């Protein structure tokens, strides 16, 4: 429901921007990236995901945030 | 039977971005899926 949501999603592929390790995983997004609309884009992006993957039993949770947990080692800001 | 007081058009999300040419594989079946649905529309600029 967003005209540039679409956009941004378009131009990714899984293979690039998508990190996948056991349960975990970092789904980074391509370079049209800090100027990102919280209210537009990126809930409505996480909103669509958490009720996809609700549709098959894969309860996802998602927790965006400008840092980086990926099993179990946190970084904030470039720093580990 | 309602043109005039209501036109159908095709979309914005309809058109492949002005951007990227037709290499691009998926850009091109948004402008295969664009001509199949032309003249459904009741658009006279649909042609264009």
Redesign the interface.
């Known amino acids: 429901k967003s ?1 540039s949501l ?2 941004i999603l ?1 131009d990714m592929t899984i293979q690039r921007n998508y990190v996948c390790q056991g349960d975990d995983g970092i789904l980074l997004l391509p370079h049209e990236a800090a100027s990102k609309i919280s209210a537009d884009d990126m809930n409505e992006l996480l909103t669509c995901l958490r009720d996809y993957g609700q549709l098959f039993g894969w309860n996802y949770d998602i927790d965006w945030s400008d840092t980086a947990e990926y099993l179990k080692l946190y970084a904030l800001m470039g720093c580990r | 039977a309602y043109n005039g007081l209501v036109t159908t058009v095709l979309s ?2 309809a058109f492949p ?1 002005s951007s990227q040419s037709i290499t691009h594989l ?2 091109m079946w948004k402008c295969l899926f664009l001509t199949l649905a032309g003249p459904m529309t009741s658009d006279p600029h649909s042609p264009v």
């Open positions: 005209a679409k956009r378009t | 914005e999300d971005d998926p850009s």
